[PDB]
Amino acid sequence: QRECISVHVGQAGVQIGNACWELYCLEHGIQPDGQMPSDDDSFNTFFSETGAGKHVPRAVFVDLEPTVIDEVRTGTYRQLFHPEQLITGKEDAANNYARGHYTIGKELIDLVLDRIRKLADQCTGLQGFLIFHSFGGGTGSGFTSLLMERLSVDYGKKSKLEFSIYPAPQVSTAVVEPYNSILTTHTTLEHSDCAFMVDNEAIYDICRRNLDIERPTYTNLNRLISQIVSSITASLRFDGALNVDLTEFQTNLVPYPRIHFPLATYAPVISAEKAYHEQLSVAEITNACFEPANQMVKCDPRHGKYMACCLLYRGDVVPKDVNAAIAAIKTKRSIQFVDWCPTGFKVGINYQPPTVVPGDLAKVQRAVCMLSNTTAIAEAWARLDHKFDLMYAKRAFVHWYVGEGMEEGEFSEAREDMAALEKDYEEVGMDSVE
Amino acid sequence: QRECISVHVGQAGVQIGNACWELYCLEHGIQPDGQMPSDDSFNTFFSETGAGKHVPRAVFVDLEPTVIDEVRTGTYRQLFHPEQLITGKEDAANNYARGHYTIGKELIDLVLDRIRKLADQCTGLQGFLIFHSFGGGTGSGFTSLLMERLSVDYGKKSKLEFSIYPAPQVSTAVVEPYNSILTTHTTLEHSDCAFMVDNEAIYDICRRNLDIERPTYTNLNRLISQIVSSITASLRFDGALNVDLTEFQTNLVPYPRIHFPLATYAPVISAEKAYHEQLSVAEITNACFEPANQMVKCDPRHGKYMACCLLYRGDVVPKDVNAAIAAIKTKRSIQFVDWCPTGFKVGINYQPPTVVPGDLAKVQRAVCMLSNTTAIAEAWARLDHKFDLMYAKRAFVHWYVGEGMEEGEFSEAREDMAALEKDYEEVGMDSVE
Amino acid sequence: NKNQALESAEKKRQERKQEQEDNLAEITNLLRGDLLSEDPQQAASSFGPHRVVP
Amino acid sequence: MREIVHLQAGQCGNQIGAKFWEVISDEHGIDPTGTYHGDSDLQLERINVYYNEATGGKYVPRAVLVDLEPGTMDSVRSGPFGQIFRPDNFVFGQSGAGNNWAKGHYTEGAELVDSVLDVVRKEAESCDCLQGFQLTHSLGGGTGSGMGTLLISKIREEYPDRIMNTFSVVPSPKVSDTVVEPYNATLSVHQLVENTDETYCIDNEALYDICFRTLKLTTPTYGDLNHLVSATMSGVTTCLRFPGQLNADLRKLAVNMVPFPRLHFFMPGFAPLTSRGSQQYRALTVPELTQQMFDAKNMMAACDPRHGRYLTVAAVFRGRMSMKEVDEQMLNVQNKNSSYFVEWIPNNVKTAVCDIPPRGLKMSATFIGNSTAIQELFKRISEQFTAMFRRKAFLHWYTGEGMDEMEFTEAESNMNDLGNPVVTRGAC
């Protein structure tokens, strides 16, 4: 009835989907074998239902290189996924946007969109697509961008939401993130309807400080990202006082057509032997989101102003304690809003408590995921701007992309589009004088 | 009363017959011997010799003894009346000629004689289903002589043909091109409808859908059987919208010399891939139009559909058919010619596809589509290129003119098929007046 | 379908084992033959142990 | 039922035929004494292709043993499968060919050919539907060249619609067991052209190259060489003799490989051949068969296929195999090596598959190739002939036995004119 398809691009996105679908199967009750245990529409939005109660995820796990799909189709959740939905090439993109977008994307895009339309045929009301990837690797940049292009020309009336692992401003994991992020953002700026960023150095910070895990892994990192996506796609899976939809997310988080870049944070990241000692009231959960330290993109919000915030409470939240707590957020001077958004909040309330996977996080009854479109992200974009300029001053790693089939002049307008984006991000910034 | 005499001609024809007859025997019950292990549905394919023996209504013909001599020594030695199996003591040697002018007009006599006996014991011949191979001596030559002679006797009676069109790339022969072009010429005014199925595509279907990385004729042959049992499923089982064997002609062959429908079975999935799909009327219908589950290597988007005949079977609710057919029309990719709006002969039988100890899985629904797309033009043109590629240096033609074929018949053939390529063009352009 | 899937998996396992046995049989029959053994008794003439087939 | 009558001429032809009858009797299950004792019932369905019935359940080969000297007499009788041939079909001559085409063609050879042809009648009208004759001989030397070509001409003018497969061992430049043999080969090619429908040229250089480089023998002998020949001799006519899918016999092979009546010369190959120490390293599959089939080390003619474009290729497979993978291997061979195949014959590879493999094996296959690269053989024999004919060397024997200088000139002219269309269709 109200369903949206999940696409997971790259190794990052595939393990995203691993954590997300493990959480989804645990909270909806789905066994790892797919079958419901013995003892009706809640799963129907994210899970199909064939025959004798066999629930198959409405997802495609695309990567250009093996062994990360092979862990999925060998390990615990092998039977849950349809083996054709997991899509695998035979040669790695090797951290090239050019290889993700121009040469080895054509061998798999026809299969990927054939299975996308196979999933969409068994969809009465299709809400949109959830696109999980990173601004790093060649698959998750180039194949994601070509996916946005052909998805826009094929299913243009539907919504496209993006879960992008933004590159950290300090550490990174390779040397070609400055090229890859700018190159994919130039061609996905006009196609992605919404684009929530999540960093990884900031989840390192969160796991170190609030979670008491000195040695976190990717399990912890995008299991927290799994918790966030289960927080935002839950009002359509359950019942709530404010049933918020994926269609409403873009309308309440995207003021200008180019500015579709929110940041996500999650509240109670508290760690079991810290949670029996604290109330975790709704004031606590809405203050932890607006602290400049629990934001999971490493960019302090006080270097900028919030355009809009979508708060999604979950659990035993009182529908009027929430606005009695939002009042304090509005009255605090350190949190500064734009003068052209007198209303800057969207409230989404559902009665489903957070589901605790076996692991670190505590049994909590109150939670909130906060999604803010802020002017602070112009600083991190300027960091990527400076990095790309430093690399492209005397053509570092350029032969890799220009001998690939990609033209040399593509970097030029990829930089001019980025400069125009920065000019937009500063033009939205200053207060009104007219 | 709904009889269907079936003539299989050539390793291809005879071997597809093994598959077709297995499926027929394991559906009606007729055991391998010829007796139904302790009611009149078999009268469309088998008979009853007032004793309990159910003899097939068919004549398997192959000028080479090897093939047919394994059906007269296998686990069906009894079912087939000794005579029905008809052989000769010399092959045709991949030479259409030595199959239509020399070592071939020497067996037309006996075969027409047997076709007569099996046809005089029929109270309602629906038609003659002929299974051959566009490439090969008996498969081209004898089939040509047969189709012609049949016309002389059985006048305008249906003569549906099932065939293995020359593949677009594989092709296990250097002479295939010649035989295929000569066949169409002789059988372009004597064939009512000619269903087509290419091995290259069935190989692909038997890898992306059945997971048999190493297909063997037995696998491909059996898949073709499920199609024949669907084209002939409404004549022996009940349904909501039955389809006869004399309707495919008036609902798939649009203009005169344009009778080359392509085939596509929808639920061609494997056991460990059916535990994940609901295989519903909609799903399977969209699958038949998908440019991959096709079976005559030829992109349907490279052309325009002229007429379609979706023959369904199983738990198919008549209303889910209307739904799917409608949704297909909406989509653009599937472009139907303007001169044919109503372009879907829908038919629904009830018997859920029979599972033969083999590869395909136990499905409750199924759809076998028959499309007459103008994208078969590329096929005829690729084959045409090869005919010319060799007919220039008069290659491999001594073999054909040293049996009885005047060398000019190759020219008359190329000319006839050029008209066919041009025909497939005129019946595709849309009137803008 | 499950019974069919397990039967097909068992059929593939049995076919692989049969193919390996056939491979080892082929290796043994060509190792023990005459072309790939250079037996001095190939020249055992039917005219007696004093002559050889030339 | 289709029959093949097997003719053997010369010492080379007689020994190749003896090894061939040994290996085909091993395949069908006939012991040395002639009776059948095997395991499969599929070895008796098509035993009447090489074996005639006798009383007491005794199978007798349909071979005509011919030589002009009674020593191959003693050799093929002293062979292990000696007491299996008819003594009446076992014709011999009280003479010697003497490495002389004149003494094989215009002498005592033409006197013995009457009895040879009479035996051919005795074994040829004792059939109901005969497919052809299969003559094994050597082009270099006497008997197999002289008697061979004379018997070829007589049987071709007697039965004109039956297929004559000649397995011809052709002289080599590296090692020569006869000084005169360019003369014999030059005279023999002229009758080989306008007569036989399928000629298999086999060279002793390439036979030893397979015996030494590939099989890695220590002391390869004539028996091993003849076994390499007889593997393809049995594998060509195997869909006529055992069942399968896409059964291809001699006529179907000739139709699919001879585009023009003079271009019937081939290059055989057989490719489950591995060394003793490298046989346990095998990964034996259809790609491995196609691999060892299509390289320029398994050819049994001394003609490298990289020096000329393949006109046609036929591969006759044996065993339980997948038609998709066989067709794919042939397709990828054609697509990857595109310069080595002519472009006026698209899909110039024929596939045949027999189900029953040879005994002691699981999966075998044979190569036949009509190639441009057999230019080299006929040219090198032509320059050797012109070198020996410019000074009239070794010619008094031929002229005294009844030849003519115009006859030698016409033989060389016809052989050079066989060298011409293999040039012009390789050059399109």
Add this chain to the structure above:
Amino acid sequence: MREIVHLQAGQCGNQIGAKFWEVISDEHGIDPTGTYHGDSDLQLERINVYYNEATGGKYVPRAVLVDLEPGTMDSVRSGPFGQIFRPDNFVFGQSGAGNNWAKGHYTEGAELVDSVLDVVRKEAESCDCLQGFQLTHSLGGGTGSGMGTLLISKIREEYPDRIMNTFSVVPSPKVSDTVVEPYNATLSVHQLVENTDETYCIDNEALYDICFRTLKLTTPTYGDLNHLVSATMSGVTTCLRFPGQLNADLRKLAVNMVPFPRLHFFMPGFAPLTSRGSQQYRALTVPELTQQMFDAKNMMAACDPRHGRYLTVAAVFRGRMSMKEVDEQMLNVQNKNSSYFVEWIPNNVKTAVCDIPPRGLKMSATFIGNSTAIQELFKRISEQFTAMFRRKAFLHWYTGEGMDEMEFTEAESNMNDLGNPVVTRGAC
């Protein structure tokens, strides 16, 4: 699935490859007979990157062993893991290179190049998605220089989109093994520039520095030196062959360590290296791995990276380990030493984390580094070539095998023209 074809050139290349296949069969669970005696499914899951299938479950390496003298290949076969390679990939020469680059590149090397190139098409065609080729050779001396660079040239010409990795043994600065090594090295670096995607320069002096000071052994052998070589060699290709997080294969290494096509000469390093006496006292952890790997003590090319700025650095870790320490330690070694990295490449280190460690150990890491300070080696071999070619040394043997006086000049000119940008990029 991806594939790698392994090539060995020279005596040094054959010994390095022998120890490499020893530790790879050790890593996967392959006994010297060849069949699998292992303890995990993941070892057999991706065994198809180095090992072809064969009958009986007998995995065979795709290694082509090349030498112009058949003396050390017999020792390789008589070694512990000797009866594991194909006898057909075992290509040798009936001559001697004699440590002469002209005799390796313009003589009998160019006669045996055909046999090696046929073998490597067999090993590339027995594939469907090849990733590339992996040559091990000694830069100094013959065969591995001359034949090796010729083989690299033909392979790179025929396969244009496959990664070529070349583990090259460069002569020591302090000691010297075959007096014409600057001739061989300067003549072969010219092809190594214009041909290879990745070159891993290794040095025996640095190997001995590790074996005497870091390993603190007394009597080390070339077995142990090639053990270190193959330790980093197997460490490079571990995400290709085992699962993990941030999988990085050879093309990823190429992309993230060559900024410009000239500077593909890397310096490897393997660093869980601790003696028998100090292994008890070690406190194995990720910061210790990073400091032992980035120290200018475990460097395996004898050029101190303190004298130059790092262009790009790649670290491939191995074992169960938390990502936060790996990222934090790489950021910390970028921050603490700021002048040792270039300023125009921010975050100039790549991280890879493979899941399965080498056994016997808990946690390991391998290093690749495109340091500017590799110019010390190239200036040293350049001055060795100039000061020796000025008086026309050893040169009649180079010009009599088919060179000319010009042929050395553009080799030294190209070597100086690579010396130039690895001054400009080191000085911004």
